[PDB]
Amino acid sequence: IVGGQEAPRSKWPWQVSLRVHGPYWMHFCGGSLIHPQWVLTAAHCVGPDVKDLAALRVQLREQHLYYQDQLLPVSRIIVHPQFYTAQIGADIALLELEEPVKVSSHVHTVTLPPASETFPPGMPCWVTGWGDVDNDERLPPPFPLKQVKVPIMENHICDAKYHLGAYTGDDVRIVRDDMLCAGNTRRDSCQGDSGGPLVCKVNGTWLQAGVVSWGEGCAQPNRPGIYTRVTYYLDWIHHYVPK
Amino acid sequence: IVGGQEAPRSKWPWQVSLRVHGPYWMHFCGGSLIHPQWVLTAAHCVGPDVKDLAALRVQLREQHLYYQDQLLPVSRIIVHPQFYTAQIGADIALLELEEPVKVSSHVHTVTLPPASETFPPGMPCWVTGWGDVDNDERLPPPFPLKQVKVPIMENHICDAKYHLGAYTGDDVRIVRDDMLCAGNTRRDSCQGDSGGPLVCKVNGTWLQAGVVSWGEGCAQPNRPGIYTRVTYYLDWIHHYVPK
Amino acid sequence: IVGGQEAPRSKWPWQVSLRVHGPYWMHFCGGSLIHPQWVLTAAHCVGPDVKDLAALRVQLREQHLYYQDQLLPVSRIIVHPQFYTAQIGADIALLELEEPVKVSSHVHTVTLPPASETFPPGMPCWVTGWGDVDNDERLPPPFPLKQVKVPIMENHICDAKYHLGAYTGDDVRIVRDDMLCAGNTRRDSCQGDSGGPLVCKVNGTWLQAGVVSWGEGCAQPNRPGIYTRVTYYLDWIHHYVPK
């Protein structure tokens, strides 16, 4: 997370940390609890190649990473089949936990938007996570969960920005239709936030508009953050995740 | 190059080394001379973002890197407008030297193939460069130009193998048509060879069939190397390079 | 600490951590509270060259590094005038706090030994700290305080071992008189523990026998840990720390 700051402990009850087995269960990606037994994340965080579930764990809402670890095993990794790379698209995945979690004020699901929802450009949204606080710049210990207010941006406008200073032809799609974008040169998500959530308060309730996907660096000029548009894959998600 | 030997002084007279400015003019990609004023290379070596031409130079064939440097300035960098990432495709580009080079037995251009050339399996080809000699293993000083004979396989054979051990649907094409496939777990090109040539001997003449592009690691099981299919972009090349 | 276990919250009330300014107040060495206003540590941790005091801070006993920081500023760095390198000797130093500390059962001083105490082999001694759990292997987060019981051996026994597999002449002392040795190939202190305490229970009381100094690697064969012998420097310590 670039810009923004440490999050109050009562905020973002659905944020989660993905841990991979090594000298210690290390955080490699963010995620979100969208259902007592399901975690929404970014496909590249766990794909394209097949993974060994034995080496993966999910950590629910934690104020400071690693301090009060309570690792939860995963039973299934469902990576969207159209995924191969973040730039191409369909960068979204599902993690089924072996046991549902006992929700509470402190830890509970976030809500998916309805297939109609669109989130207008210049709409206040928040992205959260434990990622780098800047290009090649780790979040130092005690590893607090961070948050930043980032403005949504019209799909075509981000595509347009990504063509500036680039040899890529203007009519060649870079930011694709299954993507969403937010951020500026001051506020943005970075490495370590991947698979994390982008949420916006709509009519007084929180909806996940996106999943932290990719981008050319973090908060770079004319290089806004690119996210996997959630509304776009709701049908795929609901094929596994009960309504 | 993985699984090769040091190349003799009389071979690959068209090989070139691209140099980036820094504490010293470091080698970051390969290339090939297709004309006294033009060099063929990979688009991901110089793009998708526009670079400062000043920080780039070209070194013509050397037996060992940095020892007999005679760096040459570049006046133009032309990247195929279709390019953005190597996996997507169109990983091809051109460089125009500020002056034409005097050709000879030790350094002359390579012949481009006719639009109808296929390069089918069985037919032996070679790939050259100064890249790593294995995953994460840099070429050791004095940095000799290496060569290796690589087996060519049909595009659909490689595509099917890139799906083995992957979540990507067998239906989603990975190895695209503007691409060419070669190598195995003992012979392959690695990081540092990108942009360099892949040549096959046809009717006694040497033809550049590909441009070192990408792959999942080097010489890895079920992940043969992927090269930009040169015949697919001939028309584009001729919009800049004389026939 | 090498080959230990995580330490209980009620043990080692004198153990402290030294922090140096940077992206965050990072732990670089260990120490011990010997007086409400004084901290004992290794001279190599803060010298031989004079440092900017403002850039230094001291953290009192903590169960997990960085979790609950309450950094305390330092007004004076006092390094034994005889120190230059640890192998040579006099690897001892004093830190005076700008303010005295309020002691309790969780945070109190350690008892220094009487000038005549020896600590012969077969004595119960422990060494604590936040250092590496092995050679080039950092203590993984949440960074718990570790402890390990180390076997103490006579100086001449360690001096002879350091000579095995070495070109240094036998009559050329390596482990010097103002030094003490402990540990084996399974129990030792490592990088990061430097300056911390080595305590031994003697007749119901805990006494600081030495200060973690140096060694060739950690827990390496014939290379036991070497500590500055505290009894050797009582007179010096007392020219600053009131009796």
Added chain:
Amino acid sequence: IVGGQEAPRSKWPWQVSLRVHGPYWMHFCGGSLIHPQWVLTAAHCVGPDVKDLAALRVQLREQHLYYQDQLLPVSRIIVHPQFYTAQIGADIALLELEEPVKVSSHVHTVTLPPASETFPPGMPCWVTGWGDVDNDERLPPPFPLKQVKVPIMENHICDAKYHLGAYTGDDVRIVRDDMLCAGNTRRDSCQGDSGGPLVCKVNGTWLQAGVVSWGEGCAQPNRPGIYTRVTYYLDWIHHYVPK
């Protein structure tokens, strides 16, 4: 070498390069040819712990390291018995080649100074090597052999310099009698030059006055290069090396 330049092909015909086995025979220290079959160097380059000879080699005068390599095996490694660390002293050693090298105008021995010889402070001397061109920054490829003119300085005046900005007491020796110093904030030897020679032209003839040993950083303020004084160990060398 800091603040110097590439050496003319016909200077320092005695400079040598020490190679250690690994992915390739990498340079780790310098040395000098003092007899057709003996190489003078620093003990900290090959000790204090015993090394395996099969892993060591010797490369003679080379304009560019690694280019025209012709490694020579070493029959024996003689490390002064009083050596343990560079700061303590006796940082000198001898390498006995398996064969006598055939001297020539381009490759011959340097001369040892007479026991009574005293290089006056201010003496115009030269230090050669392939070490870093500055603190933490390697010598770029093609790795030319550098040289720099460094002024010798009085042993006492250096000891004093090293106490400035240091807690070490004034009457406590840092720069000892078996050492000598040279260089300033613009001219000095650096990591990789260790074991190399420090020659001075005396009465029309080159004498090796020092062996690159140690120092705090390279070219740092009030931290001149410290070298093992050769004259001091003439008797020890002649005990092995003929006349």
